[PDB]
């Protein structure tokens, strides 16, 4: 009666079986998610409250930005492949949303450079099939869970947070409902 279904979260018609512990969806072009990451750290509250051995994935997609979006999707899985998405995502959240100067793949690989990844090494990860099925990885967990919006987390496959019934006046308090319903969830 505390955390009541339709309230801080709705259950799937249809739970996703093999799915990670906790999925999160995001899109570089999406406002809220830029609130969620940049602002509000999220991700971040929601790892540190996590029990010991539940682990956080985070995807990308593709319905949002066109082009770009798929261009991004694609270097998402090339910051997974090589380890550096806690370099990128601050850069590419900003490219895209705060100077806007993020206008096509050859910009998106310059903010690789810039954090430090060599061009070759980039280039051979961009064109690589591991990061073919990276990319084939997150649509299809997008697809499992009939993804329409963003940005969303699921718990255990079955589970879905509603942000919509939490209160906004202190972010603090608001991130630590989310953080606090999300372990409840795991551990449900």
């Known amino acids: 009666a505390q955390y009541e279904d339709g309230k801080q979260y709705t259950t799937l018609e249809k739970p996703v079986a093999g799915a990670p512990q906790v999925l999160e969806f995001f899109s570089f072009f999406c406002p809220y998610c830029y609130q969620f990451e940049e602002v509000l750290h ?41 380890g550096v998405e806690d370099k990128v995502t601050v850069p590419l959240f900003e490219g895209v949303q705060k100077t806007q100067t993020i206008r096509s793949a050859s910009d998106i690989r310059d903010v690789f450079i810039n954090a430090g990844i060599k061009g070759e090494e980039y280039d051979a990860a961009w064109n690589s099939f591991v990061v073919k099925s990276l990319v084939a990885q997150q649509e299809k967990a997008a697809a499992d869970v009939q993804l329409r919006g963003v940005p969303a987390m699921f718990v255990n496959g ?23 319903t999300v372990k409840y969830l795991s551990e449900k």
């Open 158 to 180: 079955k589970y879905q947070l509603n942000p919509q019934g939490m209160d906004t006046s202190n972010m603090d308090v608001f991130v630590q409902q989310y953080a606090d």
């Open 42 to 82: 999220i991700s971040d509250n929601v790892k540190k409250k996590l029990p010991e051995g539940v682990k956080m994935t985070k995807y990308h997609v593709n319905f949002m930005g066109g082009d770009l979006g798929k261009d991004l999707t694609q270097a998402w899985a090339v910051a997974m492949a090589l």
